[PDB]
């Protein structure tokens, strides 16, 4: 449950998604996830109407060679964004900064 | 509801009572109406003043 949510970019999982991840029925999943909140495994909110569990915290888990790559990929996305912004705002206001 | 201590809505066409305890919208827009209010009179005044040119 803790491994699956991390690796996907989304940090919300449907009870539908979890049911396939854990390869157990959605009836059992609702009971399991409640306990995750009690332990402090994951902390978050349970909505049965939107069929979601929204985490707001991912508890420290030891990172490994593979996982380093996934992080690298997310930060790539981030670096390209800052650059796009900065080029944009240089052209704009060029005449008068000072 | 008219008095106003719970301000909600009654359904005749069904039979529910919805409760809203939502007090009040923006002070910001309200005080902005006052500033505009003053300004309308002020410009006409100035114009009165500015008629020595005519």
């Amino acid at each position: 449950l803790i491994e699956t949510v991390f690796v996907k970019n989304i940090r919300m999982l449907s009870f539908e998604d979890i049911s396939k991840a854990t390869h157990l029925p959605k009836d059992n999943v609702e009971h399991l996830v409640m306990r995750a909140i009690s332990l402090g495994l994951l902390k978050g909110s349970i909505d049965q109407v939107n069929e979601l569990v929204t985490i707001s915290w991912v508890q420290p888990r030891i990172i490994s060679g593979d996982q380093i790559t996934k992080m690298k990929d997310r930060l790539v996305e981030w670096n390209d964004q800052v650059e796009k912004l900065g080029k944009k705002m240089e052209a704009r206001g060029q005449s008068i900064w000072v | 509801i008219l008095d106003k201590i719970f301000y909600g809505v009654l359904d005749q066409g069904n039979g529910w009572l919805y409760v809203y305890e939502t007090p009040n919208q923006d002070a910001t827009y309200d005080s902005a109406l006052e500033l505009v209010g003053q300004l309308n009179k002020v410009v006409d005044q100035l114009f009165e003043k500015a008629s020595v040119l005519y």
Binding site: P60, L75, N79 | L39
Partner: protein
């Protein structure tokens, strides 16, 4: 020792001393100047008041080989106590820029003198990094995991400058610059918004290449870094959230308020239009009357 070290404030005076001293001892070709730092300590703010060079030699052939003069440290203590008694011996500055492992070894001699963990004040003399002309680091001793021996290592602390009153007031007469940041008018902070984005972008790229270097060039994995990056993904706003919708409402209000302020300025500028005209109208008459009266008189 005391763990109180939170901030290190550094007078503009210490910096001036260290530069001067570096160049009057004519320590060059990455010959290190090592000098003493005096001030208060065992406080949350360490107030770094002054520095004086100590005699020092560093050999490029092998870095283990250096001299430092013990007696000079001693001589200075009774002199400095008389001059201003709030001063205490607190450690040593290094010319830097490089962070050496010869500094573990130098710290151990200063550790004899000092009542605190020896404060290492890396005052960069070349001033390449414009921002951060100072790094502060305190010697700690901590249990290194993986079944490895206890290590003595350098943990960064805020070296950020605050300045004393007496120093600051003269400095302000000298300058009149808009500096790295003054937060002055609109013009000044508008520059700042571009520069500050660019600060972040620089910072950010380095973190990207650090991760390549773990898996290409085999740096020993510094797990601390990885811990911080987890906190960045996790406490990262998520888009599609109805919080974003709220944000847009706040934006709508302020952009409107700008519009109403813009109009009020129109009323001010419009008043000036009329008053200047009034003045012109009287003056036309003043000048006409000069001409007729010059004719009559003649």
């Amino acid at each position: 020792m005391s763990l109180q070290h939170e901030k290190v404030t550094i007078a503009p005076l210490v910096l001036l001393s260290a530069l001067d001293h570096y160049e009057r001892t004519q320590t060059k070709e990455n010959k290190r100047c090592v000098g003493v730092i005096l001030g208060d300590a065992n406080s949350s703010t360490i107030r770094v008041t002054n520095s004086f060079a100590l005699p020092f030699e560093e050999d490029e052939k092998n870095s283990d080989v250096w001299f430092l003069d013990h007696n000079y440290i001693e001589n200075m203590n009774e002199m400095c106590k008389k001059i201003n008694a709030k001063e205490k011996l607190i450690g040593w500055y290094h010319s830097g820029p490089k962070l050496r492992a010869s500094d573990l070894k130098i710290n151990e001699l200063f550790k004899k003198y000092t009542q605190n963990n020896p404060l290492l004040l890396i005052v960069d003399v070349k001033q390449q990094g414009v921002g951060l002309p100072t790094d502060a680091y305190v010697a700690i001793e901590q249990v290194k995991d993986d079944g490895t021996s206890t290590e003595k290592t350098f943990l960064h602390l805020p070296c950020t400058i605050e300045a004393e009153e007496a120093e600051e007031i003269g400095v302000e007469h000298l300058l009149r610059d808009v500096r790295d940041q003054a937060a002055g008018g609109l013009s000044i902070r508008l520059t700042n918004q571009l520069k500050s984005l660019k600060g972040l972008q620089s910072k950010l790229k380095d973190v990207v290449e650090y991760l390549d270097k773990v898996i290409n060039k085999e740096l020993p994995i510094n797990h601390t870094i990885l811990g911080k990056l987890q906190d960045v993904f996790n406490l990262l706003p998520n888009l599609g959230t109805p919080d974003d919708d709220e944000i847009d409402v706040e934006n709508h209000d302020r952009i409107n308020i700008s519009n109403n302020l813009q109009k009020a300025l129109t009323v001010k500028t419009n008043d000036e239009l009329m008053v200047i005209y009034i003045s012109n109208l009287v003056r036309s008459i003043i000048a006409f009357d000069d001409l007729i009266e010059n004719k009559i008189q003649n």
